[PDB]
Amino acid sequence: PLESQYQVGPLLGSGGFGSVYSGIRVSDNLPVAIKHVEKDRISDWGELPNGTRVPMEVVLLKKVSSGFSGVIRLLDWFERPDSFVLILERPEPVQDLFDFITERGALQEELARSFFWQVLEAVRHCHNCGVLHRDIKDENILIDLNRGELKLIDFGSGALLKDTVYTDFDGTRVYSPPEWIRYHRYHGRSAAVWSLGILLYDMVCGDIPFEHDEEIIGGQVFFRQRVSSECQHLIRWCLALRPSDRPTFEEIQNHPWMQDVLLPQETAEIHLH
């Protein structure tokens, strides 16, 4: 029974994360986030390793739930007549990266480097576990302000990672790649790299570069803030119009701009405390 294992608290973020409520596990007072998803609104379904029919979001969350602090951990889930309930870990204190950038403006490159590196490691963990997130954006990244650790959240648009072409997409359009805009076709890794270029521009410029379809497909990146030549080069490479011209994750992490990253604790002490 859900209501016996958890003391349920008020809505978190006034619905901005979805139907997510504060909670505490009665077993050990562990803080949790309790996310509700309506069966009627769930598009993609999968099966757990035993065979039970569950939302794809649960399948993907279970696949990445092993120990790496870079992705949000699913602690348990429950099925109800009309919905599924997901028990997620709740780091505290947190602020999501969208609100962080709004309040602080364009981030210093040392801080952007630390955040971007952690996002790359978290996305690599997903792919290593057979999961494609498909909605990487600052709104879906939580910052643990005390530990300087970032958490990727919201697998509600994700899919099993495959090497063949994707013809469906329900993530965020302004982070989606031009081959999706133009042809409704994309491959998972190179589309992820495009969204990471959007995210990195967002961090060092204070907002995303493109709002309209014509900007996404046009191939021009204007820098509205002072950004180093090395960082500009990485962003423009991630935002190559043709997917085969984009870097691999290995090439991103070996890029000159990515060298000498801060540790998470160093990041918190220099930039967050």
Binding site: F98, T102, E139, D154, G156, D170, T172, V174, D207
Partner: peptide, 10 residues
């Protein structure tokens, strides 16, 4: 200053 906003996925 420019207009920065969230974008729904869904």
């Amino acid at each position: 200053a420019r207009k920065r906003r969230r974008h729904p996925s869904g």
